[PDB]
């Protein structure tokens, strides 16, 4: 997250931190995700496409820090890694993935002060352009940074119309109706590398809702180059069927 503010998991308790174990034993951060039911985390396909083996991954819930334990956190193996069959690839189409989570003890997520689910939107129901939404992740704080922040961050961006995002000087044909663009009016805050898979959350008629999933963008916090998010309200049947797997 470029700009914005440091936060803790109490302020985004559906946030899932996803890591990959390497040959040799080392573990690295991959992407964010969102807990949508006790056994299911939703994320982005692009995070996993090069290493689609479920055994490689570790998922944490209730975690506020990248490389240290947070009191009350839970650790999970990935029981099933489901990628969207129509994925294509910088402007990724159908960039959505599901992770079924199971602990070494064979259990799913147990809700607590630091672990909660996020509601899915109603079908084809999105907030109007100009609406403020929040994004959360452990991604870079500056485009030129080598390291990820150690502490979770969040910021606020505003929804951009498909009409505006389709302009040549924005993204042109790269952005489809199954995607949502969001940015800061001064381009001063944005998601960045390592924020992929994480939640874009808007209040849709009073309730917090998973509007989008961090997917792609050209650079970070650059003029005329918004963040692009998978439009969750356009994938409800896909989510519905695959969460029975």
């Amino acid at each position: 997250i470029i700009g914005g503010e440091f936060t803790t998991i109490e302020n985004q308790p559906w946030f899932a931190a996803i890591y990959r174990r390497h040959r040799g034993g080392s573990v690295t951060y991959v992407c964010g995700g969102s807990l949508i039911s006790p056994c299911w985390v939703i994320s982005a396909t692009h995070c996993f496409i090069d290493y689609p083996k479920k055994e490689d991954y570790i998922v944490y819930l209730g975690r506020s820090r990248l490389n240290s334990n947070t009191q009350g956190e839970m650790k999970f193996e990935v029981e099933n890694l489901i990628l969207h069959k129509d994925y294509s690839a910088l402007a990724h189409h159908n960039d959505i993935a599901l992770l079924k989570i199971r602990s070494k003890e064979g259990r799913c997520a147990q809700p607590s002060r630091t672990i909660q689910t996020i509601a899915l939107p109603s079908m084809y129901n999105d907030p109007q352009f100009g609406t403020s939404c929040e994004i959360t992740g452990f991604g870079k704080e500056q485009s030129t940074d080598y390291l990820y922040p150690e502490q979770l961050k969040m910021t606020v961006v505003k929804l951009i119309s498909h009409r505006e995002c389709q302009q040549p000087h924005y993204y042109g044909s790269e952005v489809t109706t199954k995607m949502l663009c969001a940015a800061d009016p001064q381009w001063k805050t944005d998601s960045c590398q390592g924020d992929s898979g994480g939640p874009l959350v808007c209040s849709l008629q009073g309730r917090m809702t998973l509007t989008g999933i961090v997917s792609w963008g050209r650079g970070c916090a650059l003029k005329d180059k918004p963040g692009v998010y998978t439009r969750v309200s356009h994938f409800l049947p896909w989510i519905r069927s695959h969460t029975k797997e």
């Binding site: 090069d50 910088l90 590398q193």
Partner: peptide
Amino acid sequence: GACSWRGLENHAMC
């Protein structure tokens, strides 16, 4: 480069 952008995390070429 592209390997430093959203969309290319956990990629073989990066």
